[PDB]
Amino acid sequence: GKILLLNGPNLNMLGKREPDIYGHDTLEDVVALATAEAAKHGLEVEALQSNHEGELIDALHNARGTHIGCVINPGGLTHTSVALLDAVKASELPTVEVHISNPHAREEFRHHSYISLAAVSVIAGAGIQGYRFAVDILANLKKL
Amino acid sequence: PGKILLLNGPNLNMLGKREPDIYGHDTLEDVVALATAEAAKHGLEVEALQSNHEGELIDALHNARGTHIGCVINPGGLTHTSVALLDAVKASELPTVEVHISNPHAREEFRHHSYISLAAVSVIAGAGIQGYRFAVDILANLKKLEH
Amino acid sequence: GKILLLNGPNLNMLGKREPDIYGHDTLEDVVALATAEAAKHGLEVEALQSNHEGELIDALHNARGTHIGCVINPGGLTHTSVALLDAVKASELPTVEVHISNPHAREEFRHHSYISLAAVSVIAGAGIQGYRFAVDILANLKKL
Amino acid sequence: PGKILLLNGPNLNMLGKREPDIYGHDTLEDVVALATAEAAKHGLEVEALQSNHEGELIDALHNARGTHIGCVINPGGLTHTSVALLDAVKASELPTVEVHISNPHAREEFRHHSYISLAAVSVIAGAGIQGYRFAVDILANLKKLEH
Amino acid sequence: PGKILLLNGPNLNMLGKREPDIYGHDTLEDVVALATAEAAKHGLEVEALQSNHEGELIDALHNARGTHIGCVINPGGLTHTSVALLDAVKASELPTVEVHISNPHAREEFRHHSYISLAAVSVIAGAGIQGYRFAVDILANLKKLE
Amino acid sequence: GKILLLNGPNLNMLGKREPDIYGHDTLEDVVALATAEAAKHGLEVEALQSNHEGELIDALHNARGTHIGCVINPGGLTHTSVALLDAVKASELPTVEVHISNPHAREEFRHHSYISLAAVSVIAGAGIQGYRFAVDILANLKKL
Amino acid sequence: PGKILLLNGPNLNMLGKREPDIYGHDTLEDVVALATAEAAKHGLEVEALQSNHEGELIDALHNARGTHIGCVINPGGLTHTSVALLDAVKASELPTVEVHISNPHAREEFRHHSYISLAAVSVIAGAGIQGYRFAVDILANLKKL
Amino acid sequence: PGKILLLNGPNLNMLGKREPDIYGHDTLEDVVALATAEAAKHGLEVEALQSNHEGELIDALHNARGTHIGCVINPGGLTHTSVALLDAVKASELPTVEVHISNPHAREEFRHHSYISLAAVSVIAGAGIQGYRFAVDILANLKKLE
Amino acid sequence: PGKILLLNGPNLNMLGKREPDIYGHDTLEDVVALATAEAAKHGLEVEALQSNHEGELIDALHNARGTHIGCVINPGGLTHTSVALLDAVKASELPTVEVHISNPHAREEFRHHSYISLAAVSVIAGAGIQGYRFAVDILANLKKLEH
Amino acid sequence: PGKILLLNGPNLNMLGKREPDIYGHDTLEDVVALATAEAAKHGLEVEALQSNHEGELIDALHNARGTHIGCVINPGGLTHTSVALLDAVKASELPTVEVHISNPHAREEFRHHSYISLAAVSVIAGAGIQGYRFAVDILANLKKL
Amino acid sequence: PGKILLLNGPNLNMLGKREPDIYGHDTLEDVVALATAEAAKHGLEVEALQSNHEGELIDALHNARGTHIGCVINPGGLTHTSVALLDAVKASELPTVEVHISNPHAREEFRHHSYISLAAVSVIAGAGIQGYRFAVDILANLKKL
Amino acid sequence: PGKILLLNGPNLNMLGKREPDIYGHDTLEDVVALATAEAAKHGLEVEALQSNHEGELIDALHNARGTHIGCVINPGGLTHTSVALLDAVKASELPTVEVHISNPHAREEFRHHSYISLAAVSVIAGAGIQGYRFAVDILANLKKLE
């Protein structure tokens, strides 16, 4: 069983700026944590990070029927992309939306999510542990 | 070690009653049991309170200041309306996880705003009652001065 | 057969200020009128007035399955309380919303009603006779 | 004693035709009959007019000034759009009850505003055609200088 | 002689009895008489129409194209609501003066917008029925220059 | 088989102002084009143009069950009339909304259409050819 | 003997030069001349002020309280922006006619709102400088009643 | 002697420990003591109630009708949200002074609206707990004139 | 004579896959075939491109400037969001017909705004894939300096 | 020795005459008198200015920088409209108490917003002229700490 | 010979003192000096005015009509509020470059709107006092063409 | 020498032919040449990239972190729409000058908002391609002080 792990724009920079101020956790840390949780359920993870909205949409489309679900952190595309929302819908994958930080503690333009309209679940502000909980949700939906 | 304050707001006592094949079969008892079981995995306890009275939830937040490690709250309809409850979360100084069973963003526009999200360390929506399990996990693992 | 008659905040003050300016009708008048109409249909009325939103919600919850319907004048909670709307829904009682005055002739913040989203019927500006008409609606829905 | 002006606006002539098991089987004839029967209980008469033409309803309001005791109106879609109809209600000086068969607040956002509600003594929504019966009862019992 | 189209929209037939504290006690007959007297000073005539029917005002505008020097219009409630009536004023090509008896910008917020003001050469509000007299003056003097 | 062709306020003035600036096409041109397209499908056209909203509503009501569909250019009523929207719904006719010009290139108050909420299809800015395409849509829906 | 306060707000001194396709070829001198001549037909006088300084218009309104029969005002850009000027019109207790040379409701959205229209007995827009003549007519005939 | 109703809404019991950088270190006891001392200067008494329950504040207002010279209220969060509490202030007929410790108009936009300000005779914000002292002064002097 | 640029935006490749009895059975291949067939009736050709990448559609618009007679575009979700795509339509100077298969006005409020409608000569919504056929007809018949 | 800058903005000179049912029968002289007498109880002086000219209030704020302990201001209609005046209060670095005689949040919606409240340490509304006395009390006791 | 009108609106006289973390440590004297020196490199002169009085800026715009090659303006808080000043820029017919020391679109929402940007040929924000140098460069080179 | 990243977003490759009445007749080559000449005056180089692809601009920003003294960006349409691009400017830690050829605040209301202005040190609009010259000047002089 395979989960699609998608990380959107800027997520490649996790842990790359001064980590004492901007965080020590890296994208590799995110993938490893999601992968280890998936392994507890006999599942695998296909991970992709891209600063290109089209590469995420292509990935969602290509995973239709082949994956049990999608964990997505869309980054700034959260607030802006109808096309990304329509790609989650077209994929027909049960999708969990993850934010490492709590967008509602940030600027008001970050409060709105298009993805939240189609996501089965939304996890914000749990740090990279949101990706662990997202894998648990998809593992357990699939079992039901 | 320590105690988590579990707060369920108005209407949460009625979980599982209306059209369960559409809205869910899980009950408030199931919620408290699931959170209490996850807390035990971390050597923690849960003090659960459900109320239809905003002031009862505010009283509980105030009384838990300095004696509890954190709060898991599902404010129900107060989520969208109560400044006083947000100020009670801040006054408690409890690190707070906001939980919704359903995804409010899939519902009416008035349900898309949360006062509690402004102060919550984390917000979990649409994971069913599993949201409460992940909330207990977050509070168990939070360290002083994180983020 | 029993109808739940709920009166929200401030309704206890009906008829208590100078009645020539603020009205002669009292809460007792409201309960008696609803009760007499209910009696015409072989029905009874359980009446509660509270300045506490929680006492109304508790009442709605406790009347689930035991009452044929709810007549509610929510007072200022009309415009503000999502929790009260969700309590009407959770009660599963057919609910008639009553306003003694016409809110639409008052300040604009009184124009919006959360209760109107779940109420079967809304009666405004008929004075205390709105409670009579509300009982008639519930008596006749029950008969069908 | 006296005559009530019963006004039904655009589309009310088509009551009972579209998906009646969902929207209703009652007809305009049923509405006029029900209001006329309630009026008779109070020694009153009804003059009923339905029109798809705003100006016909305005003409009728003007012509009823001083000769009728009040107006029961269901403006249909004009409810949300017509300042001229509101001004015609005011010009008629008829105490006016606004009636909707369905509850407009359960429908699209544009149906939540009513110009007529600003001038109406009473507004009844969602009582089916029984709304017209209660409206006649209100006008029968209204006293000069009430509220 | 040249002719001015005087159009009064819904409810203006009720002038005199209609909310006098707002509209005064002057009647539609008084409005037409004053406009007619002012036009005569300029050697002009007035063709007056009041209707409660938006389509009658539109028909009148179309039918006045090319035979009238201009239009004086009080659209009443239709002021705030009718795109169709604005489009009829434009299609008539009549220089159009918009008149209101009350001052709508001192009244409810729903009266603050005017479709007709987008096409009117001039707008007069709150001058009781004298607005119609000034409107005729505007049109007589526009025609003299053009 | 009959199509109801409705033209709303001001459409009678098509081609009547200086045509080099305001257009040469006339209402007669619109009716002839729709009629000729309908004839290609063995269908007829009943055409009505009115500056009166009530005459359009009456027409829609009277065509219930007797016509295969309605082509409507509502003119300025597009943006304003809930009553006209409710008349399209009450008619139960499959309805195509036509604009000769593109309203979205005009003032912002012309961007909103009530009719678009009930119309099966919306054609804007194709000139009078939008009426031809509207007839094609209704001919082909009827065949299915 | 009866006196009308004629106030013109910012930029009105530039009439005849300022954006002629919007405001026309008439001058502030033409405006004052027309208002003055109309007032004389009613046996009234005109005290005219134009200023680019809001405070000078407000002082003029206060100073005319109880001594003048009314005010004709074209506030210019202050029409859309100044609560202080609205409050000065109300403090003056002068019946006030608001005049605009241009039709503001045919221009940018920010010109659609007028604080002065909340207190004005009458508003005239788009009649060129003739709006000032009609405004004197209004004030002359309100006083006469 | 005359009596002033001092009402503090939700969270004000936590004054002292609650967000001191915003609310200061003065306690509810300090608030009640200062109001009580000021009232005594005017030969008046204070009946103080704090509650986290909107209905207890409403009950208190109803029950103070006709036995209190006025009300000093800090509604806390309910300021921005409660029509019911405004309606209770109105029904009490108590001359009402609205007090805020912080300046809400310098804070989040959701704190910029006040239902209570629609019925309050006066509103004092941002004067720490001294707002309650000035509020008592307002009510003592209103009563002296009326 | 000449070539029409047919652009289909994000997700249009997935046409016909999700709940086809509800959303439709027609495919992107059907769209290209229908537009290509109508173009042939007018002695015209079609260059079709579908992409999930906004920049690919912008590149295509730029590369078609002066070499194509017009553009038929269904921007998909970019309709509501992309200023850059509107500016690419303007930079191409291609007369452009905007096509939607479904009627966006019957859907969520955010789908009611189109940047492309501001520059498009025509907008067709809700004619199914027949919209693309009418779009090709419009471009075939457009004359220089019309309207 | 300590000096308080007392500023009154447009129309305040008309107190006692201007819309008495809203503003009452007290005068600007009563306001300055009350503020002056309260300041004296704290051993402070008052420098009072009223102007219908925004620029005169802004100059006064700049000129009081570093020499005064605080500002009491009633901006009048400028309360709702002037970013320049807010920026003048911030440039002054004076602790500022905003005073309104009327309760603006009980009046027209356009009076609900105050640029000055963004910088003011305190806002008093609806206490008649007594708000100016409480404002001096605030400034006296902030300085004392 | 060619003359540039340099206008600074309210509070700009307080540069170097006013909220240094937002506006920096440069003075109005530094601003005028930099603009003057840049204009000289193009053989142009600068006529500089700063005022806390909107009416003084409007008078300056009118008085520079036809005699000056362009205007560099920092309107201060009036940027967001004054239709009268926008209309004065249009009446002047001067090519106008709008300058802000701070980046207003990085500050409070009420600073996001500029009436002046509707008429300005160019807008420079956040370049400190160097924006005034670039503004002279723009005006010098528009005139040269 | 130090290097400045010059980024041009969608449609700017079409400068010269694109709506000249709005953007002028200067080409992207001219933009790059002018920025390059100005940088040389300060002993600096320019690395220029134009793309119609938001992700290529983001990749460029990430890849320029720590090797460039600053960024000059004209985001084109993405200005008003892209949170992702703002977040990339922030993550790059490059002092960033935002440049527009046209004055967007004199144009459609949808052009009035800029995400990039929230992180840019400076914003220059409406100076034709000279905005890029001033932008280089800003970055050369910021670097000299820091």
Author numbering:
A (entry chain B), C (entry chain B), F (entry chain B): 3 to 146
B (entry chain C), D (entry chain C), I (entry chain C): 2 to 148
E (entry chain A), H (entry chain A), L (entry chain A): 2 to 147
G (entry chain D), J (entry chain D), K (entry chain D): 2 to 146
The authors write:
Dehydroquinate dehydratase (DHQD) catalyzes the conversion of 3-dehydroquinic acid (DHQ) into 3-dehydroshikimic acid in the mid stage of the shikimate pathway, which is essential for the biosynthesis of aromatic amino acids and folates. Here, we report two the crystal structures of type II DHQD (CgDHQD) derived from Corynebacterium glutamicum, which is a widely used industrial platform organism. The enzyme forms a homododecamer consisting of four trimers with three interfacial active sites. Our analysis revealed that the monomer is composed of repetitive α/β domains, forming a flavodoxin fold with central parallel β sheets arranged in a specific order.
We determined the structures for CgDHQDWT with the citrate at a resolution of 1.80Å and CgDHQDR19A with DHQ complexed forms at a resolution of 2.00 Å, respectively. The asymmetric unit of the citrate- and DHQ-bound structures contained four and six molecules, respectively, highly homologous with alpha carbon, with root mean square deviation values within 0.2. The citrate ion exerts a weak inhibitory effect on DHQD, which is enzyme-dependent. The CgDHQD structure in complex with the citrate ion exhibits two different binding modes of the molecule. The citrate ions bound in two CgDHQD chains in the asymmetric unit are stabilized by the side chains of R19, Y24, N75, H81, H101, S103, and R112 and the main chains of S103 and I102. The citrate-binding mode is similar in that the stabilization of 3-carboxyl and 3-hydroxyl groups resembles that of 1-carboxyl and 1-hydroxyl groups of DHQ, as observed in the structure of Helicobacter pylori DHQD. However, the other binding mode of citrate in the other chains in the asymmetric unit is uncommon, wherein the molecule is accommodated in the active site with a half-opened lid loop. In this mode, the 3-hydroxyl group of the citrate molecule is rotated by almost 180° compared to that in the general binding mode, and the molecule does not interact with the residues R19, Y24, H81, and R112, which are essential in the general binding mode. This unique binding mode illustrates the possibility of various interactions for inhibitor binding that do not mimic perfectly fitted substrate binding. We identified the DHQ-binding site of CgDHQD and observed an unusual binding mode of citrate inhibitor in the site with a half-opened lid loop.
